[PDB]
């Protein structure tokens, strides 16, 4: 079966370099042209570069030309992307895509995330979003946790050690002007349960080895 697996993605400071790789299997690699396609947060697919079958020819999108170098090693069944002079705008999921006679991109990898930031690894501060009559509507009360100022992504948020799943909404993270991420996780419960039922958000941030449990009181 045709498979493409990207690797090398991670956190990189602006102006620095990073090399991505794409491991190909289930087909003769040297038969096909290969491409890099990226997707920045809340943006569409952006073609990055193409390399022909034997690596003798390359072409780049205007956004990367002069900064990125596409290459390949046919005996290694590997495609590379050498990225130089990285900028905040380069933050994206980078996909490896097989080219069918320079036509459609028939097979794509899972992608590798590249984060271009000058921010350092930081654990989140967890704040409650307290329920009351003000957060009560039609027999239901809303409460939550604000997971502020962490870097890099992701954070995992569970409620009452994963026992509470109904009425849970964990919002996508937002990148603040500070370069730190922030997210809110909310839960809607019967309004009568406030004062009788305990609600705790379990926040885990793997990159900084941080585990925070916050009691959300009315």
């Amino acid at each position: 079966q045709v498979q493409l697996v990207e690797s090398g993605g991670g956190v990189v400071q602006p102006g620095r370099s990073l090399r991505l790789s794409c491991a190909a299997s289930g087909f003769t690699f040297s038969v096909y042209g290969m491409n890099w396609v990226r997707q920045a947060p809340a943006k569409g697919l952006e073609w990055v570069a193409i390399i022909w079958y034997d690596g003798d020819n390359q072409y780049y999108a205007d956004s990367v030309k002069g900064r990125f170098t596409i290459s390949r090693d046919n005996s290694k069944n590997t495609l590379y992307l050498q990225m130089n002079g990285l900028r905040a705008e380069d933050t994206a999921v980078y996909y490896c895509a097989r080219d069918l006679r320079t036509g459609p991109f028939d097979y794509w990898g899972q992608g590798t995330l590249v984060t271009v930031s000058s921010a350092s690894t930081k654990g989140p501060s967890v704040f409650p979003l307290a329920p009351s009559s003000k957060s009560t509507s039609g027999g239901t009360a809303a409460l939550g946790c604000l997971v502020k100022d962490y870097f890099p992504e992701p954070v995992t948020v569970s409620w009452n050690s994963g026992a509470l799943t109904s009425g849970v909404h964990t919002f996508p993270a937002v990148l603040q002007s500070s370069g730190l991420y922030s997210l809110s996780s909310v839960v809607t419960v019967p309004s009568s349960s406030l004062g009788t039922q305990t609600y705790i958000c379990n926040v885990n941030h793997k990159p900084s080895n941080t585990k925070v449990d916050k009691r959300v009181a009315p």
């Binding site: 697919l45 073609w47 999921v93 704040f127 979003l129 509507s137 939550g144 909404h169 996508p172 809110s184």
Partner: protein
């Protein structure tokens, strides 16, 4: 440079109904136009190659048509799994380009959001920052706008919002908007309000609180 534009930007489809989305090219590209489906945070997949050729493994309900500058992707009898972003891409001339995408979602009855405003916690205020949260819960369609008002004065540039993907259970969306001010700026004002506009509401709804 060949530019691709897709229309509409967003479309809502009822299951079992037919849907046609378009891709327009800046210059003639013949039949060198390909269609892709992409679900949130997932790998894109090829649907139609060279404007009208079905790709191996793609369900028979997907079809493509067009030549030159005008292209169409048709989903005959839409299934729930077809809610995704659809992109077109031209292989006619270098540099290769993609269209901006068309987001297709599941159509359901209009649902107004339940709006709640959360003052900053006392713990956060101690650290010198105040985050005010406006929650818009379980609404349809996806289009919604949040307007922060501080003592009836419309705010700008000091808020950030996040929207969930379409819920697999009830087909609604939820949105959270955070207004961020320093402790000193927060204490200079009394009334904090968030005004929500949505198709499900005849008049925009306002939820507020008094700081003191």
């Amino acid at each position: 440079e060949i530019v691709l534009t897709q229309s509409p930007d967003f479309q809502s489809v009822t299951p079992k109904e037919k849907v046609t989305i378009t891709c327009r090219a800046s210059q003639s590209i013949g039949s060198s136009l390909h269609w892709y489906q992409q679900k949130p945070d997932q790998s894109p997949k090829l649907l139609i190659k060279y404007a009208s050729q079905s790709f191996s493994g793609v369900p028979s309900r997907f079809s493509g048509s067009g030549s030159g500058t005008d292209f169409t992707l048709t989903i005959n009898s839409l299934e729930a799994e077809d809610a995704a972003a659809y992109y077109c891409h031209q292989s006619s001339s270098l540099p290769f380009t993609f269209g901006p995408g068309t987001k297709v979602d599941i159509k359901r009855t209009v649902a107004a959001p339940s709006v709640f405003i959360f003052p900053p916690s006392d713990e956060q205020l101690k650290s010198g920052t105040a985050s005010v949260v406006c929650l818009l819960n379980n609404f349809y369609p996806r289009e919604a706008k949040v307007q922060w008002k501080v003592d009836n004065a419309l705010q700008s540039g000091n808020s950030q919002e996040s929207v969930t993907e379409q819920d697999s259970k009830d087909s609604t969306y939820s949105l959270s908007s955070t207004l961020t001010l320093s402790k000193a700026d927060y204490e200079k004002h009394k009334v904090y309000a968030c005004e929500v506009t949505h198709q499900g509401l005849s008049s925009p709804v306002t939820k507020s609180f008094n700081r003191g």
